[PDB]
């Protein structure tokens, strides 16, 4: 049974059925396409069905380098001894490198503009082309690797290709860890949750299970609440870059042609820096660009991302809201009144109650994004517990964590302490004005912007082997 073209419920399809008086799909014979996640143990009449993580759990920039040896190999430039990642051999972004194209059997990117004939990009992860803003970040890190590899070849002449690649790969990974725990996570969790779930690092602990928990795959989708209905692009002076400065997100998904033919990554990165994220409010959860029109250009029907999240949590056999609250040592509301109190919103509690009947059955993504956000944070207590617990494990249970004794020298850690996302943008783009740290807070130009010249670039002197 073809899950993409049929609404029949049979393995491995789990189509979302359509309710009566649906705002968009008036045909209740239709459905939202859904493929069940691959079972870890197919056909077993013994195991409790589990799902598979195809990537390394570690914050190791695997979305740059890949999580399988064949891929990691194919992503490298193996035509010289410079330790570089291969770049696009058909296009450049105002002199700079693009990601190589991929060879996909049913390339969705081509369908976003039949004229353009621009396929999806090839990267460490298979979703790099899903939105141009994501593609731009992959492109950024790709360039930083090559730049590091180049400077590294300068400091240490003897270092061969393999050495260059690995040392450059090691710095990029550290950069991803640093940006993530120093700048990103504190603004996700807020002050209190950050102190609680990520106490000061001590050192590697080999008893700390670093695997991603099934529940994390759904809870961390909290980000879907931060999505704006447009892709914003701005010129070198951060003004709307015509003729299409604000394209609907439903016409940017897999649109790799926009990166190649519409100005490169500079206009995209500026848009990310100088545009406010959407705020998560209890009656403004997620925009219709993803709730009604997700992937509209590349399949028979527009998808509903929030709907997919709830369908997926059930596909994965994930416990309901109260089980996760209990797990997190948080009170479990049983009445609509109790729920109202936990949510500080009686109206929302009522809607949830009328849909689910009991707070025990609220799907984890729905319940999670439904809680009022913690002070200076962007998730509630439940998601904070789930996300913070996950990241502590990814940190403490990683033998190659950048601060672990032995990974980097004391002076190498000093050097890495000076890296920033703004700085990386400065080193690999035409953009000479970038957001002030913290880049995830700054969002108003020119008030929150500074010239690149005032920001010190990574000093690799302590990488000298001499």
């Amino acid at each position: 049974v073809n899950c993409e073209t049929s609404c029949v419920q049979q393995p491995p399809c789990f189509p979302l059925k359509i309710p009566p008086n649906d705002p968009r799909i008036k045909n209740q014979a239709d459905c939202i396409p859904f493929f069940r996640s691959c079972p870890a143990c197919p056909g077993s009449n013994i195991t409790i069905r589990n799902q598979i993580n195809a990537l390394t759990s570690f914050v190791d920039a695997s979305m740059v380098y890949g999580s399988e040896e064949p891929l990691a190999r194919n992503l490298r430039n193996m035509s010289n001894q410079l330790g570089l990642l291969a770049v696009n051999q058909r296009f450049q972004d105002n002199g700079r490198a693009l990601l190589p194209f991929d060879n996909l059997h049913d390339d969705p990117c081509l369908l976003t503009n039949r004229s353009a004939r621009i396929p999806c990009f090839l990267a460490g992860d298979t979703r790099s082309s899903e939105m141009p803003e994501l593609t731009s970040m992959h492109t950024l890190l790709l360039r930083e690797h090559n730049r590091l590899a180049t400077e590294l070849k300068s400091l240490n002449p003897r270092w061969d290709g393999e050495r260059l690649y690995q040392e450059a790969r090691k710095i990029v990974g550290a950069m991803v860890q640093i940006i993530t725990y120093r700048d990103y996570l504190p603004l996700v969790l807020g002050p209190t949750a950050m102190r609680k779930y990520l106490p000061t690092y001590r050192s590697y602990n080999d008893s700390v299970d670093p695997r991603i928990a099934n529940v994390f795959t759904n809870a961390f989708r909290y980000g879907h609440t931060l999505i704006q209905p447009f892709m914003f692009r701005l010129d070198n002076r951060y003004q709307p870059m015509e003729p299409n400065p604000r394209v609907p997100l439903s016409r940017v998904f897999f649109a790799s042609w926009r990166v190649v033919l519409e100005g490169g990554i500079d206009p995209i990165l500026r848009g990310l820096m100088a545009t406010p994220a959407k705020l998560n409010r209890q009656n403004q959860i997620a925009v219709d660009e993803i709730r009604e029109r997700l992937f509209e250009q590349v399949m028979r029907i527009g998808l509903d991302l929030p709907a997919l999240n709830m369908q997926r949590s059930r596909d994965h056999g994930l416990p309901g809201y109260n089980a996760w609250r209990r797990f997190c040592g948080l009170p479990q509301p049983e009445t609509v009144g109790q729920l109202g109190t936990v949510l500080r919103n009686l109206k929302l509690a009522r809607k949830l109650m009328e849909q689910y009947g009991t707070p025990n059955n609220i799907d984890i993504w729905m319940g999670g994004v439904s809680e009022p956000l913690k002070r200076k944070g962007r998730v509630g207590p439940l998601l904070a517990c789930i996300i913070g617990t996950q990241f502590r494990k990814l940190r403490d249970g990683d033998r190659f964590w950048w601060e672990n004794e032995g990974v980097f020298s004391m002076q190498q850690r000093q050097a890495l302490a000076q890296i920033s996302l703004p700085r990386i943008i400065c080193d690999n783009t035409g953009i000479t004005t970038v957001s002030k740290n913290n880049i995830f807070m700054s969002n108003s130009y020119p008030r929150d912007f500074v010239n690149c010249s005032t920001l010190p670039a990574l000093n690799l002197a302590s990488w000298r082997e001499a």
């Binding site: 928990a213 994390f216 795959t217």
Partner: protein, 104 residues
């Protein structure tokens, strides 16, 4: 696992020497809580018509989205203290952490 190494493996194998596959690619996720399936081992809630969950009807995912998530875009509230880069780093980071394969 090699007694000594210099860098991460590409798959993550051997990061944890006592349990070599932990954190590595193409491995089952860890369960922080026992899974909850309609038949207790494999079918998702909402699969079989008339089958309730814990005493109550399973709500259609699309119905919950329509009822609780749907909102008029003109009400959208720009986050005065977060950049859109905040959203983007999130997605990028999610893509360093997990990808859940499905059949083609």
């Amino acid at each position: 696992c090699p007694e000594q190494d210099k860098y991460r493996t590409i798959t993550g194998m051997c990061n944890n020497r006592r349990s070599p596959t932990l954190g590595a690619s193409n491995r089952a996720f860890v369960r922080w809580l026992p899974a909850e399936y309609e038949d207790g081992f494999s079918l998702p809630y909402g699969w079989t018509p008339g089958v309730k969950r814990n005493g109550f009807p399973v709500a259609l995912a699309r119905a919950v989205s329509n009822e609780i998530v749907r909102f008029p875009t003109d009400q959208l509230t720009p986050d005065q203290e977060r950049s859109l880069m905040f959203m983007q780093w999130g997605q990028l980071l999610d893509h360093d952490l997990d990808f859940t394969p499905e059949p083609a």
